[PDB]
Coordinates of all heavy atoms in Angstrom, one line a residue:
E4 N 47.3 31.0 10.2 CA 47.3 30.0 11.3 C 47.9 28.8 10.6 O 47.6 28.4 9.5 CB 45.9 29.7 11.8 CG 46.0 29.0 13.2 CD 44.7 29.1 14.0 OE1 44.2 30.2 14.1 OE2 44.4 28.0 14.6
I5 N 48.9 28.2 11.3 CA 49.6 27.0 10.8 C 49.6 25.8 11.6 O 49.7 25.9 12.9 CB 51.0 27.5 10.4 CG1 51.0 28.5 9.3 CG2 51.9 26.3 10.0 CD1 52.3 29.1 9.0
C6 N 49.6 24.6 11.0 CA 49.7 23.4 11.6 C 50.8 22.5 11.0 O 50.9 22.3 9.8 CB 48.4 22.6 11.5 SG 48.4 20.9 12.3
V7 N 51.7 22.0 11.9 CA 52.8 21.1 11.4 C 52.5 19.7 12.0 O 52.3 19.5 13.2 CB 54.2 21.6 12.0 CG1 55.2 20.5 11.6 CG2 54.6 22.9 11.3
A8 N 52.4 18.7 11.1 CA 52.2 17.4 11.5 C 53.4 16.5 11.3 O 54.0 16.5 10.2 CB 50.9 16.8 10.8
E9 N 53.7 15.6 12.2 CA 54.8 14.7 12.1 C 54.3 13.3 12.5 O 53.6 13.1 13.5 CB 55.9 15.1 13.1 CG 57.1 14.1 13.1 CD 58.3 14.6 13.8 OE1 58.2 15.2 14.8 OE2 59.4 14.4 13.2
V10 N 54.8 12.3 11.7 CA 54.5 10.9 11.9 C 55.8 10.2 12.2 O 56.8 10.7 11.8 CB 53.8 10.3 10.7 CG1 54.8 10.4 9.5 CG2 53.3 8.9 10.9
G11 N 55.8 9.1 13.0 CA 57.0 8.4 13.3 C 57.7 7.7 12.1 O 57.2 7.7 11.0
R12 N 58.9 7.1 12.3 CA 59.6 6.5 11.3 C 58.9 5.2 11.0 O 58.1 4.6 11.8 CB 61.1 6.2 11.7 CG 61.8 7.5 12.0 CD 63.2 7.2 12.5 NE 63.8 8.4 13.1 CZ 65.0 8.4 13.8 NH1 65.7 7.3 13.9 NH2 65.4 9.5 14.4
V13 N 59.2 4.6 9.8 CA 58.6 3.3 9.4 C 58.4 2.3 10.5 O 57.2 1.9 10.7 CB 59.4 2.7 8.3 CG1 58.6 1.5 7.7 CG2 59.7 3.7 7.2
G14 N 59.4 1.9 11.2 CA 59.3 0.9 12.2 C 58.7 1.5 13.5 O 57.7 1.0 14.0
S15 N 59.3 2.6 14.0 CA 58.9 3.2 15.3 C 57.4 3.1 15.6 O 56.5 3.3 14.8 CB 59.3 4.7 15.3 OG 58.9 5.3 16.5
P16 N 57.1 2.9 16.9 CA 55.8 2.7 17.4 C 55.3 4.1 17.9 O 54.2 4.2 18.5 CB 55.9 1.7 18.5 CG 57.2 2.2 19.2 CD 58.1 2.4 17.9
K17 N 56.1 5.1 17.7 CA 55.8 6.5 18.2 C 54.5 7.0 17.6 O 54.3 6.9 16.4 CB 57.0 7.4 17.9 CG 56.8 8.8 18.3 CD 56.7 9.0 19.8 CE 56.5 10.5 20.2 NZ 55.2 11.1 19.8
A18 N 53.7 7.6 18.4 CA 52.4 8.2 18.0 C 52.6 9.5 17.3 O 53.4 10.4 17.8 CB 51.5 8.3 19.2
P19 N 51.9 9.8 16.2 CA 52.0 11.0 15.5 C 51.8 12.3 16.4 O 51.2 12.2 17.5 CB 50.9 10.9 14.4 CG 50.0 10.0 15.0 CD 50.8 8.9 15.6
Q20 N 52.4 13.4 16.0 CA 52.4 14.6 16.7 C 51.9 15.8 15.9 O 52.2 15.8 14.7 CB 53.7 14.9 17.3 CG 53.8 16.1 18.3 CD 53.0 15.8 19.5 OE1 53.3 14.8 20.2 NE2 52.0 16.6 19.8
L21 N 51.2 16.7 16.5 CA 50.7 17.9 15.8 C 51.0 19.1 16.5 O 51.0 19.2 17.7 CB 49.1 17.8 15.6 CG 48.5 16.6 15.0 CD1 47.0 16.7 15.1 CD2 49.0 16.4 13.6
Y22 N 51.3 20.2 15.8 CA 51.6 21.5 16.4 C 50.8 22.5 15.7 O 50.6 22.4 14.5 CB 53.1 21.9 16.3 CG 54.1 21.0 17.1 CD1 54.6 19.8 16.5 CD2 54.4 21.3 18.4 CE1 55.5 19.0 17.2 CE2 55.3 20.5 19.1 CZ 55.8 19.3 18.5 OH 56.6 18.5 19.3
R23 N 50.4 23.5 16.4 CA 49.6 24.6 15.9 C 50.3 25.9 16.2 O 50.5 26.2 17.4 CB 48.2 24.6 16.3 CG 47.3 25.5 15.4 CD 45.9 25.6 16.0 NE 45.8 26.5 17.1 CZ 45.3 26.1 18.3 NH1 44.9 24.8 18.5 NH2 45.3 27.0 19.3
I24 N 50.5 26.8 15.2 CA 51.2 28.1 15.4 C 50.2 29.2 15.0 O 49.7 29.1 13.9 CB 52.5 28.2 14.7 CG1 53.4 27.0 15.1 CG2 53.2 29.5 15.1 CD1 53.2 25.7 14.2
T25 N 50.0 30.2 15.8 CA 49.1 31.3 15.4 C 49.9 32.5 15.0 O 51.1 32.7 15.2 CB 48.2 31.6 16.6 OG1 48.9 32.0 17.7 CG2 47.3 30.4 16.9
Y26 N 49.1 33.5 14.5 CA 49.6 34.7 14.0 C 50.5 35.6 15.0 O 51.2 36.4 14.5 CB 48.5 35.6 13.5 CG 47.4 35.9 14.6 CD1 47.6 37.0 15.5 CD2 46.3 35.1 14.8 CE1 46.7 37.3 16.5 CE2 45.4 35.4 15.8 CZ 45.6 36.5 16.7 OH 44.7 36.7 17.7
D27 N 50.3 35.3 16.3 CA 51.1 36.1 17.2 C 52.3 35.4 17.8 O 53.0 35.9 18.7 CB 50.2 36.6 18.3 CG 49.8 35.5 19.3 OD1 49.7 34.4 18.9 OD2 49.6 35.9 20.5
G28 N 52.6 34.2 17.2 CA 53.7 33.4 17.7 C 53.4 32.4 18.8 O 54.2 31.8 19.5
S29 N 52.1 32.2 19.0 CA 51.7 31.2 20.1 C 51.8 29.9 19.4 O 51.7 29.7 18.2 CB 50.2 31.5 20.5 OG 50.2 32.8 21.1
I30 N 52.1 28.9 20.3 CA 52.2 27.5 19.7 C 51.8 26.5 20.8 O 52.1 26.6 21.9 CB 53.7 27.3 19.3 CG1 53.9 25.8 18.9 CG2 54.6 27.6 20.5 CD1 55.3 25.5 18.5
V31 N 51.0 25.5 20.3 CA 50.5 24.5 21.2 C 50.7 23.1 20.5 O 50.6 23.0 19.3 CB 49.0 24.7 21.5 CG1 48.8 26.1 22.1 CG2 48.2 24.5 20.3
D32 N 50.9 22.1 21.3 CA 51.0 20.8 20.8 C 49.7 20.0 21.0 O 49.1 20.0 22.2 CB 52.2 20.0 21.4 CG 52.1 19.9 22.9 OD1 51.9 20.9 23.6 OD2 52.1 18.7 23.4
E33 N 49.2 19.4 20.0 CA 47.9 18.6 20.1 C 48.2 17.2 19.7 O 49.0 17.0 18.7 CB 46.9 19.2 19.1 CG 45.5 19.4 19.7 CD 45.5 20.5 20.8 OE1 46.0 20.2 21.9 OE2 45.1 21.7 20.5
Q34 N 47.7 16.2 20.4 CA 48.0 14.8 20.0 C 46.8 14.1 19.4 O 47.0 12.9 18.9 CB 48.5 14.1 21.3 CG 49.3 12.8 20.9 CD 50.2 12.3 22.1 OE1 50.9 13.1 22.7 NE2 50.1 11.0 22.4
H35 N 45.7 14.7 19.3 CA 44.5 14.1 18.6 C 44.0 14.8 17.4 O 44.0 14.2 16.3 CB 43.4 14.1 19.7 CG 43.6 13.1 20.8 ND1 43.0 13.1 22.0 CD2 44.5 12.0 20.8 CE1 43.4 12.2 22.7 NE2 44.3 11.5 22.1
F36 N 43.7 16.1 17.5 CA 43.3 16.8 16.3 C 43.4 18.3 16.4 O 43.6 18.8 17.5 CB 41.8 16.4 16.0 CG 40.8 16.9 17.0 CD1 40.3 18.2 17.0 CD2 40.5 16.1 18.1 CE1 39.5 18.7 18.0 CE2 39.6 16.6 19.1 CZ 39.1 17.9 19.1
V37 N 43.4 19.0 15.3 CA 43.5 20.5 15.3 C 42.4 21.0 14.3 O 42.2 20.4 13.2 CB 44.9 20.9 14.8 CG1 44.9 22.4 14.6 CG2 45.9 20.6 15.9
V38 N 41.8 22.1 14.7 CA 40.8 22.7 13.9 C 41.2 24.2 13.8 O 41.5 24.8 14.8 CB 39.4 22.6 14.5 CG1 38.4 23.4 13.7 CG2 39.0 21.2 14.6
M39 N 41.1 24.8 12.5 CA 41.5 26.2 12.3 C 40.8 26.7 11.1 O 40.4 26.0 10.2 CB 43.0 26.3 12.2 CG 43.7 25.3 11.4 SD 45.6 25.4 11.3 CE 45.9 24.7 9.7

């Protein structure tokens, strides 16, 4: 089970993003937290 986390650029006010990918190719985007 995998999680990819991305944070904005130094200046950017963009809120961090999280993605979760599972063993069967399912993928969901979470904006607060991920547990696995």
Side-chain angles (χ1 to χ4, degrees):
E4 195 160 316
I5 294 173
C6 179
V7 172
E9 174 168 46
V10 64
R12 301 176 197 170
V13 190
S15 180
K17 181 63 179 67
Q20 189 65 59
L21 305 177
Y22 292 89
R23 197 185 72 238
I24 307 85
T25 59
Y26 60 86
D27 73 330
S29 294
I30 176 181
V31 303
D32 60 304
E33 230 66 282
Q34 203 162 308
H35 291 161
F36 67 85
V37 170
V38 176
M39 42 183 209

